[PDB]
Amino acid sequence: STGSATTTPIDSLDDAYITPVQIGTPAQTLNLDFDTGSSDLWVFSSETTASEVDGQTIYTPSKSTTAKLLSGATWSISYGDGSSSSGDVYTDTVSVGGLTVTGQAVESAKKVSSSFTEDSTIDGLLGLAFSTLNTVSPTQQKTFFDNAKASLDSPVFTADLGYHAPGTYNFGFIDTTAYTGSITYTAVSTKQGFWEWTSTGYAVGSGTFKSTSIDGIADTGTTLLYLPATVVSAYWAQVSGAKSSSSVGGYVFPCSATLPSFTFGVGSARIVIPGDYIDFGPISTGSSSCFGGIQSSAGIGINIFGDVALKAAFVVFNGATTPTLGFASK
């Protein structure tokens, strides 16, 4: 089997992407944030504290003839940005882009933190990291991809995120029309539960490539590109007036600037992030100070190849017995 679904930016800055997901019988369609940096599929639901729902579409298990309470199971997750959610668990039928899993753990939120409430466009998350990170207790549950794997024509999914435009998540096949040149594959460590790999270096604008190993994770659920302070300093040093602001919480730059591109290495290959991809607009409405899309990972504890990086590429998440990552230009 295969699946293919369109993923759409939630706003004009590509702060995140939502992908329609059919849950239950008859289908309830929710728009979920596909997240390769976590491993829970959770949704706003009829069980979510009423004051914490504001415009989201909810999953109502009682209206699904295929929903079954997973007795005793609870979940609780906190994300790198400080947001969190928690609740109980149903199994139900979940379909993505024509691809159907029966018995998928659907994690029903009883509580969500303010940032989820405040985002009416995201109805939940669909985790695509490794199942070892799944927070369901006392019986850990498998991701959607893990459950679908055996049925897929090929044990892979691909992320093709758009810049200010829709893109695609495909399951079970590689669309050879969706990229240019070849796909370069690189090794993955699953030891932390992430799609963790090692970039072979970087360049700033038309500058020469610096060969240096940068361990990080391919994370569709993170907006920006988080890299070592040395790298990030080298990038922003090429932008007149750019500075790190503790009051704003990272690098900002004059909105009048033209940003340089940023290149990262995948083995011997190179992925170029256009400078426009690194502009995340005024820090506040009407401000002439703009927020940078490349930020320091110092104090995160890990480098994150988030949407800023991934949307410049066609990315293959290969879940074969020995997982790997593939990157192509597009």
Would you list the DSSP string of 18-53? Answer: EEEEEETTTTEEEEEEEETT---EEE-BTTS-GGG-
Nearest alpha-carbon partner for 77 in 89, 94, 92: 89
> Is residue 301 exposed (0-12), middle (13-18) or buried (19+ Cβ within 10 Å)?
exposed
* DSSP, res 137: B
Name the residues annotated as catalytic: 35, 199
Residue type, 177: T
> Structure solved using which method?
X-ray
Q: How far, in Å, CA of 59 to CA of 66, rounded?
A: 13
Tokens 């959607």 — which residue?
144
Say whether the peptide bond before residue 254 is cis (omega within 30 degrees of 0).
Answer: no
Say whether the peptide bond before residue 26 is cis (omega within 30 degrees of 0).
Answer: yes
Q: How far, in Å, CA of 109 to CA of 96, rounded?
A: 20
Q: How far, in Å, CA of 262 to CA of 101, rounded?
A: 39
Q: How far, in Å, CA of 18 to CA of 125, rounded?
A: 9
| Domain ranges, ordered by start, for the chain | 5-174, 175-330
* CA distance to 34, 167, 173, 260, per residue, from 179 (Å): 21, 12, 13, 23
Query: What topology does CATH give the domain 5-174?
Result: Cathepsin D, subunit A; domain 1 (2.40.70)
At what resolution in Å was this solved?
1.8
Q: What angle do CA 328, 151, 28 make, to 5 degrees?
A: 90
Residue type, 219: D
Domain 175-330 has CATH 2.40.70.10: yes
Number of H helices, E strands in the chain: 4, 24
Same fold, 5-174 and 175-330: yes
Overall residue count recorded for the chain in this entry: 330
In degrees and rounded to multiples of 5, residue 58 shows phi and psi of -110, 150
C-beta separation of 10 from 122 below 8 A: yes
Q: What CA dihedral angle connects 42, 43, 44 and 48, to 10 degrees?
A: -40
Nearest alpha-carbon partner for 79 in 294, 304, 268: 304
Tokens 């400080």 — which residue?
82
